[model samples]
Target: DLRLHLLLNTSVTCNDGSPAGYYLKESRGSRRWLLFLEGGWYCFNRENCDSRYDTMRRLMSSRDWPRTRTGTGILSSQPEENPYWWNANMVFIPYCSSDVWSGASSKSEKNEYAFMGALIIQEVVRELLGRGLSGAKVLLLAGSSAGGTGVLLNVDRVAEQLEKLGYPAIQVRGLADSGWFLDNKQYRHTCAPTEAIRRGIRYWNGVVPERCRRQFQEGEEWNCFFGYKVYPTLRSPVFVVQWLFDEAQLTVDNVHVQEGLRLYIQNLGRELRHTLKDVPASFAPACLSHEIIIRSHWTDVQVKGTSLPRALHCWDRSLHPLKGCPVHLVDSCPWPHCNPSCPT
Candidate 1:
């Protein structure tokens, strides 16, 4: 097995390099694993670099290695830094956003197209392995929020590459936390963190509003991978984890928030049956906030681990262990937090 050491470099020329402070593992095995770490809107700017890096580090710390998903056994870890890449027996890459792509677009003129670039990278990896890199059997793609959107949006492009490479049984598993997949119009009008709204204004600037309306008219259809359709094509046993009350404070009222959560579950249900068999779903209920999902014990999964109900508006640095979560519910967060509703 071969191993490579990846260092951090933030120079503009290091555009292809990862942000600083990331590590990768190269294990020689029959198949290669690519684990993508997702970042949130707050971590987009220089001001939040440290926080973002720390978040990634915490998540990595919480992750358990040598686990099996979708019947594919693989190795995994988190990557940090930019302009640097690693080619271990397996490949580990960490993705970071530039000023423009982060939420601080007003301060930066460059268009932040991290997701677009990520898709391109996905294609590149497939091409490289296809040429002759034997033993490339699976592609384990997972992320949260924008990272989730990034993976889902590029699913077809990924599928196309896999098909071209003659790998028909490739498995693609996705995990999204408070993802922003509402119709683009709804996203523009309802969701906040205002920076995204500003970007949408520019994205659909001159186009007729109705023409743009069509872009998101069908809620779960536009992005086939994210929508309800990509299920059938996905390799069997796709796992989905969602939260009831995400701590993002997306809107003043909980109506939109509730709908968003409902949509994710509805789509996952439709897709699971269409794609894989006996696929199980797991969830951490309301008040479990965004950060908690990331901070969760890495060992928790579909068939095992403690399924306790905990509530908190948001789980950030301020949270302390044993203080429990911010919000308190009568019966914890409701037991058996699984989709397709666990048997009675």
Candidate 2:
């Protein structure tokens, strides 16, 4: 009883009509497997798909998107739907507004070409349906912050366009969260104060420049964890959920401009091999700041079982500890004691 072809909020008007979208939720099960739901940056539209913040939309409106078979309960119903779908194949895209990050270096090259044109429609649907689409089998590209930096900047151009549509063994899967990166090296701003960092350095000198305002006033090497230019040519198998005090942006000393947008999402998770599962138990009762840990980790990635390990510190305390260390470091810990190596 886990059928969900939902596909809510799908828009892509282009040609100047301008209405790009991305609050997707695809869940199919007859076996081939697929579960994609990328969203972040305040997830606009649909009034932020509630459930109080996302419990996979209360397990896909109750149908519970396939996972039972003794996986440990979650096969309920009653949420209701079917105004007219009939096995539509889940697809919920609703996170438009170019996933905001207006630190503007003159509009950061038009906000990086409008997030590379809304990530070319998820790289043309894994390059026109990664082969053997005899009728859709597997395709899971998830997200969280800025849609997990658009799924790590387009998971290897959508797995090389699904291996050129030949299906070179297509089974893609990526789930990112707390992701962002424009560049700066790990994040820094110092909780705003000096007159809100001089009104955000005068809005970064009217939107970026002056060498990106001397690299956000010289903080140096912000890695955003880029995954060697999109995870070793994608084949699928990525699941990052970094938070290290990710109060909207990584925090060691966060301030305005979101510490260059949290070092552009920790250099985009320093390219990969990153696994800190659920940092301080999903941001330990979030309230850290940076806009309330980006809305409390988007309601803690829709609760349920909450998978994503390798470095899961699981910070528990609920309230208290608002800034910096006191208990909030997930991966790496050497260079300045939190380097958490990934690219390997």
Candidate 3:
């Protein structure tokens, strides 16, 4: 097992002005690097951030972060469970800026906080280049939940940044887990973060990909924050891992009624099917959970005969399927919690 080292020498700071940090675990001979960004939901306004500062202080500030932490799920070093690329170098990032990895400013009296999520990621990559990331053959930028959304938001940016840095051939791919959320206002109430995204772009001086940003009209740039809206425009190949009935999306929408919940789940499944059918690589089961790539049971979840690890490997390595192996799989059963492997 490779013991981890926490690196915090970057110039970027977190929301509350502590140096940004990430964990590194190296392998002896592999050049494959999987960088996992930690996820934490953000607050668009200072009042919301003020609220978070009190209750979610850990996310708002990195002042108390530990020196070491273990990796699980895809980050796991155990070859028995994480069969594919277990020996690849690992980087685990912690979410502290409350911007879903999109913020780009330092602290100021007027701004009241740093909100430097995007800057933190950029600086981390810049720092890692000298350390070893420059020689890598593959850089799998994977994240969970908000971090997963972060992967979609930043994968191409990383690819482009590395290309400018003279490492253009390094395969930069995205593995987004439970992050393909929708702007459900078109469907119903308690839907999205359009207003939050609106605040985000201005408050954090957020950087949206030029390609996707150009596609939207002024004041509609917030649409890119929603996965379904931005997925089409992303240049890098992304393997989206989502649960058909994601509890996080349901909770955000505040669907309380049992029957309402069932109908909502049904609609969510339909929407995912319609949106993800052409994505090339996706794994969505009829489970009611959020964030699995960091969990111990990630290996146990399978869809249409393909496990999550298997699908990820196939997607990144360009491996041909032995049979009709399902890589771009969504639950054929549209109902909620229809899969027998759902966590009990």
Q: Top model by lDDT, which number?
A: 3
Q: What is the C-alpha local distance difference test score of candidate 2? A: 0.34
Worst 10 residues of 2 by lDDT: 70-79
lDDT of 2 by residue, 85-163 (tens): 2232333333432322212122243322122234434533632343224355445555556566556545555566657
Error of 1 at 327 (Å): 28
Q: Which one wins by lDDT: 2 or 3?
A: 3
Report the C-alpha displacement of residue 244, candidate 2, in angstroms: 1.6
lDDT of all predictions: 0.35, 0.34, 0.81
- Candidate 3 CA-lDDT value: 0.81
- Candidate 1: tens digits of C-alpha lDDT, residues 1-344: 21322232222111222322222344455353555445444233333444544554332221222222221112223322110112223333333432211111221245322212333234335434543334555554545555554454444445566677677665444433344333222223433334433433343121111222345454312333232334334442233444443334334223344776666544533333333223233343333335323332322322222232222111211222335333221112232244232222
Better by TM-score, candidate 3 or 1: 3
Select the stronger candidate by TM-score from 1 and 2. Answer: 1
lDDT of 2 at 271: 30
Candidate 1 weakest lDDT stretch, 10 residues: 79-88
- Please state the error at residue 280 of candidate 1 in Å: 6.5
Flag regions of model 1 displaced more than 4 Å. Answer: 1-23, 30-32, 42-92, 98-116, 123-134, 177-238, 249-284, 291-296, 300-344
